[PDB]
Symmetry: D2
């Protein structure tokens, strides 16, 4: 009953599972009408149907964020059917495993850069007309890896430092149109591979998925109306250690 | 929204400006508020206006540079309430002086004394109460804790110090379940060209737009956030 | 006369013009043997031939840093002929003009990301065996735009923030091999002003309105910090991005 | 023999031992005339006399950087005898051990803030006239603790974050006078919180902090101001 996103239209990418599904549900619980898209359209539609059954307003579709024609088609549809977009959450992303001095780093780099950076660019750029019409806002999914190397593969680290910068320059160019642009920077969340994080996090625990959803909703809401260009760590103290 | 329902919140510098607005905002989110200020008359006037609206509030004089007076307030809070759910360190001052001027020394001592040394005094003294409640701390940092901007040296340094204080308090108090964070505002409604030329939103923030992020950080919405300094600056630091 | 890079083999990309040419000359003056490469092989060879005429040891080649096959061929040639590489300077870079809400931003993004980020990755990754053999080091060309948006187009800002992160993670993965990885982050320097018709009126105001020194940097003032980071003076510095910006980022 | 500081007058605080003594020696080896000051004047003079015995030009004095009268006296002496100061290195500093929730943290805080931050302010502010006359530059000793909490006591972490900010605002106010202001941010100098995160898996040698200080103090850094340079084996990038 908090209603931070009351009657706002919210598009979440990568919404078929994990954090994206949880952001979609959290936005709906804050009053939003939610468009869920995912490379797996069946999963996006299943999440949307579950939200509809709970009494929320939601729809799901397949979207490959690396396909510029498909991204443009979705943007055109949103503008036509709704007149604008109040919130874009760029959550679609992947990770991988490879050290920089390994040949496998190249394939991993291309895959991860392609979804995490180039896909976020595609969706963000295509949705500018709809965001302008509604004076909406954008929340990107950054990472603690956008600030330090941590333990992730090079393509992931670089994609998230790239998102940090994308947040700043989108904020600059879209401020004259009343569009805020921010990002969250989680550590590891519920949705010795993790020792690099667990050995440094002050709270000595992995964050609950809801604990990343809440800051996303905050940044997308009028509580954050003087916040733009900003990346908010949600990391149990990792970057302060 | 009930974000702070029945939580006890202490705000320093609460007799005027942002501090009074944070106090009112916490009360509107369901908190019981202790307002303290160097001007105890103003703190009690703010507290009485909250009481008239049906909130639970009280006001006191507090000089944050007086360690004895700070300790007496911390002892009072622990004895009367058993703990403290939120500390907001908002008391602060500024001044005008370039570094190469003799006046920079007096300004430096005054600003460091309130903004940094006073924040240390209050933070350190309230640790027992914060431990008992597993409370949290929100400091008032500034864009000046990240770049020099246009503020006097003592102010810039005091806010960079607060940025570091946020991190190390978070480290030492995490084992006790205490989160420690800060907001970093730009120039506030409560010359300024250095800020206005760079702020992306091309406007000064409303006081309520700094209150809301403080309430967010003090609330369970921020339960996995600690050691963090959140700019509330209209895009200034991203420019 | 300092000999900070005495007898080291240095590879500079984008070395046919501007800052890249100046880094190549500065490295040679510090005692290095320099391989200059540029998308324009004729320009790289003209710069290398001028260094040879001056009395230095240098060679020039064409290299498209976006062509992974060409990059691999150069890396194989360096390893075979020299057995390793002491310094890699990833200087090749481009910019552009387009606001994010314009359709033109896409073509500019693709071009700038392609050279600045993907090219730096191509060259860095391909040269790892040569850098391991020599225990060499890498200096990337970042920018103040890797820290704030400034006045640059989105593809440039993002490419330079990406380079900042690339510096960190390369440093992490190559430190066990004795390879340091750092970057400089310049503001504007004089080489970027050398073509008058491309200096749009007011185009430097984003920088000049903030820089504490109230001047564009001399090209040599960016060359010197590159040489420092590439030298044993910086033997405990890795993963670091050094602003060379007249105070811009501190303002 | 790179001569990066040839004929420059360099003042180093905390110069009686450790890094400060090494910066003084390294500055002399780069051509500088060096004034060494330390809370222990005997140690400052011992370091200075050793440099004199090598044919360098050096002198040593006691200085308590927390004593504003004594700092002013040294500034007046430098202006009178030399007319300017080419480099100031603020290296005097202390640390301590106390967790924030302990009562001992207050005394440790006061001691560490007093030397590291307030002493750096005292010396920097008092030497502005001499730095102006020479268009000199300042190098502060920051720390990785000015960027993250690491393992140091609260007063140390806060003192170094304060120095990071002091670097920026001194650079701003002194740039119109041709004075650059920078800092180095070392890690642990010649511990698991540091060692487990440093990429080079070693503590830096003292000479490896001296060289970046000399770089920042030199014309190689003539377009560098307001900057804090980590000298930390990759710790802050990890």
């Amino acid at each position: 009953h908090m209603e931070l996103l009351k009657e706002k239209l919210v598009l979440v990418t990568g919404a078929g599972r994990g954090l994206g599904a949880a952001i979609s549900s959290g936005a709906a619980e804050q009053g939003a009408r939610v468009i869920l898209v995912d490379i797996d359209g069946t999963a996006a539609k299943a999440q949307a149907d579950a939200l509809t059954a709970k009494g929320f307003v939601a729809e799901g579709h397949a979207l490959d964020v690396t396909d510029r024609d498909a991204v443009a088609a979705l943007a055109d549809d949103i503008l036509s059917r709704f007149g604008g977009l109040d919130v874009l959450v760029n959550n679609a992303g992947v990770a991988g495993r490879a050290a920089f001095d390994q040949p496998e780093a190249v394939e991993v780099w291309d895959r991860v850069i392609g979804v995490n950076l180039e896909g976020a660019f595609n969706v963000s750029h295509a949705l500018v007309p709809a965001l302008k019409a509604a004076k909406g806002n954008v929340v990107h999914l950054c990472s603690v890896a956008g600030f330090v190397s941590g333990g992730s593969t090079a393509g992931y680290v670089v994609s998230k430092g790239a998102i940090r910068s994308l947040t700043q320059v989108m904020a600059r160019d879209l401020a004259p149109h009343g569009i805020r642009v921010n990002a969250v920077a989680p550590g590891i969340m519920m949705s010795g591979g993790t020792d690099w994080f667990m050995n440094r996090v002050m709270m000595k625990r992995i964050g609950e998925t809801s604990e990343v959803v809440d800051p996303v909703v905050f940044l997308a809401s009028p509580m954050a109306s003087y916040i733009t260009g900003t990346i908010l760590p949600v990391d149990g103290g990792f970057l302060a250690a």
